[PDB]
Amino acid sequence: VETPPEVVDFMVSLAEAPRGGRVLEPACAHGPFLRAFREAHGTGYRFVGVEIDPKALDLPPWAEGILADFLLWEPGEAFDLILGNPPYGIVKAVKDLYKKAFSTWKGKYNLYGAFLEKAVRLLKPGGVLVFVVPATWLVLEDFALLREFLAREGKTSVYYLGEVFPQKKVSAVVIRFQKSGKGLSLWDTQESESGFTPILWAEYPHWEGEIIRFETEETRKLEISGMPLGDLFHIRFAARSPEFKKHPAVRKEPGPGLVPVLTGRNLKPGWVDYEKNHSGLWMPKERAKELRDFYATPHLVVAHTKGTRVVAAWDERAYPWREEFHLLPKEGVRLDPSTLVQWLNSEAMQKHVRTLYRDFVPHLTLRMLERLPVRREYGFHT
Numbered sequence: 238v239e240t241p242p243e244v245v246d247f248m249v250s251l252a253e254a255p256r257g258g259r260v261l262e263p264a265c266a267h268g269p270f271l272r273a274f275r276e277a278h279g280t281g282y283r284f285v286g287v288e289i290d291p292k293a294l295d296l297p298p299w300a301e302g303i304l305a306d307f308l309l310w311e312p313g314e315a316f317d318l319i320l321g322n323p324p325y326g327i328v329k330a331v332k333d334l335y336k337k338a339f340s341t342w343k344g345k346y347n348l349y350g351a352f353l354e355k356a357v358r359l360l361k362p363g364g365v366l367v368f369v370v371p372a373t374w375l376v377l378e379d380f381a382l383l384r385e386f387l388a389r390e391g392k393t394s395v396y397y398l399g400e401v402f403p404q405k406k407v408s409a410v411v412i413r414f415q416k417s418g419k420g421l422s423l424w425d426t427q428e429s430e431s432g433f434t435p436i437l438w439a440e441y442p443h444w445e446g447e448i449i450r451f452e453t454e455e456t457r458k459l460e461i462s463g464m465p466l467g468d469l470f471h472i473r474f475a476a477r478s479p480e481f482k483k484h485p486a487v488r489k490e491p492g493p494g495l496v497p498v499l500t501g502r503n504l505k506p507g508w509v510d511y512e513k514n515h516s517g518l519w520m521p522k523e524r525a526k527e528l529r530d531f532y533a534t535p536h537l538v539v540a541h542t543k544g545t546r547v548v549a550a551w552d553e554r555a556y557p558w559r560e561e562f563h564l565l566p567k568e569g570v571r572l573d574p575s576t577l578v579q580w581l582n583s584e585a586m587q588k589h590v591r592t593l594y595r596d597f598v599p600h601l602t603l604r605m606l607e608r609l610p611v612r613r614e615y616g617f618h619t
């Protein structure tokens with residue numbers, strides 16, 4: 238993803254460093270941030286750039302260039318200011334090595350997470366870092382260890398930019414971090430002719446690494462006046478195609494006594510389309526429970542393939558599914574399906590989920606789902 242000029246401008250104005258202080262740009266190429274900073278803040282600093290590809294390293298005379306893998310680079314020096322746009326993405330052994338090297342590494346992780354941990358470690362006390370990175374780390378669990386690390390190493394400011402790169406499936410966020418432990422500040426941002434204008438949204442001085450959300454008075458009212466979905470239901474996952482394909486009784490052409498294996502396109506807001514087959518697999522309904530027992534019990538289905546919105550339906554016939562979230566009520570819990578469903582698909586529920594998580598991620602996640610508030614008269618534990 239390329240960095241627009243106005244975004245670079247925005248980051249440079251959040252950047253500060255003492256005269257004579259060292260300024261570094263990891264994964265520099267021709268050094269776009271080194272250049273912009275010098276023009277806006279002056280020449281009285283030491284400029285360094287670290288690039289792994291010698292063909293890409295193209296820095297002006299006043300800057301010092303280092304050919305190396307930033308992630309494995311040990312300068313023996315600490316910096317005052319670190320800024321840049323780290324590569325986004327996942328990558329064995331160079332990886333494995335990394336895993337050993339980085340404590341916040343969890344799951345598949347992402348290179349931008351490693352660059353973050355690395356950058357924070359090369360910072361002098363009180364030093365600052367300004368990076369443009371994806372917004373996924375705010376809600377995903379692979380980044381739970383990263384959030385804690387940041388939470389305890391200094392104060393964090395998160396500025397929401399959104400989908401600002403010409404490539405539209407990535408929502409961006411600018412993080413300004415100073416190595417002087419002191420909570421979290423969430424900022425919104427206004428886009429105009431001049432560039433970006435920040436707007437303080439909320440402050441969390443006691444932040445310990447919890448999920449970051451855009452909360453409002455109304456979202457709070459809604460969450461305290463109900464029970465979270467995750468208290469009333471067990472959230473199960475469906476079996477995948479391989480599991481189905483390895484199952485005798487599973488066919489590939491229709492036939493008598495065979496029902497289609499339902500997918501997300503069969504799920505509509507408020508109802509299920511049992512007609513269309515979108516998987517190309519069929520099997521006798523009664524043998525479904527052999528793959529997952531809950532397949533034999535009529536239950537609630539919420540989608541994860543339809544974006545950041547709540548689409549729910551009650552599977553009254555109990556058919557086999559290849560995806561989506563499957564909710565089975567906990568013991569003692571008695572609910573009214575019809576109204577629970579109406580509630581979940583409501584225009585109130587969509588605005589709630591939209592306000593809090595915006596477009597951080599491309600689809601509803603387990604953590605977002607389990608906190609959805611079930612208004613008292615739809616379901617309760619007896």
Ligand SMILES: Nc1ncnc2c1ncn2[C@@H]1O[C@H](CSCC[C@H](N)C(=O)O)[C@@H](O)[C@H]1O
Nearest residue numbers: 238264266288289290293306307323324325
């Ligand atoms: N491990 C590493 N160490 C140092 N430089 C690296 C590096 N990995 C990539 N780079 C360099 O940093 C530049 C990529 S910049 C990343 C742009 C954008 N955020 C994206 O996701 O694509 C390239 O010039 C590359 O050579």
